Amino acid sequence: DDEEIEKGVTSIVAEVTELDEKEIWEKRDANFFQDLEIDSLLALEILALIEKKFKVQIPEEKLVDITSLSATIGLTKSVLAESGKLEHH
Ligand SMILES: [Zn+2]
Ligand SMILES: [Zn+2]
Ligand SMILES: [Zn+2]
Ligand SMILES: [Zn+2]
Ligand SMILES: [Zn+2]
Ligand SMILES: [Zn+2]
């Protein structure tokens, strides 16, 4: 479900970065490491929490595309589609 994925990923990134969910959402097209003070350890932790939340496996190599909230949401959606459990509109 698009909305459920967008809110679940926003919640994860807000928790990891210790920022507000609304403010993260406003900065959804912003670059993670340039603008919102993220590390590689924090991106690894986002990836892990997304795996657990949506009950999916995501290969490590995909840390390449954890570069913005929008990119992370797109990653989650594509990985859900590969698992036959995305309902997109
Ligand atoms: Zn819904
Ligand atoms: Zn949307
Ligand atoms: Zn803290
Ligand atoms: Zn808050
Ligand atoms: Zn956009
Ligand atoms: Zn994994």
**Could you tell me the residue ranges of all domains in the chain?**
1-89
C-alpha to C-alpha distance for 71 and 31, rounded to whole angstroms: 9
What is the CA(79)–ligand 5 centre distance, in A? 19
Instruction: Report phi then psi at 52, rounded to 5.
Output: -70, -40
Q: Any idea which ligand is nearest the CA of 14?
A: 4
Residues 61-76 as b or e (16 or more Cβ within 10 Å = b)? eeeeebbbbebbbebb
Ligand 3 mean position to 54 CA, how many Å? 24
Binding residues: 6, 18, 20, 29, 39, 51
**Experimental method reported for this structure:** X-ray
Resolution in A: 1.8
Q: Residue positions in the annotated binding site for Zn(2+)?
A: 6, 18, 20, 29, 39, 51
Rounded Cα distance between 86 and 45, Å, is 23
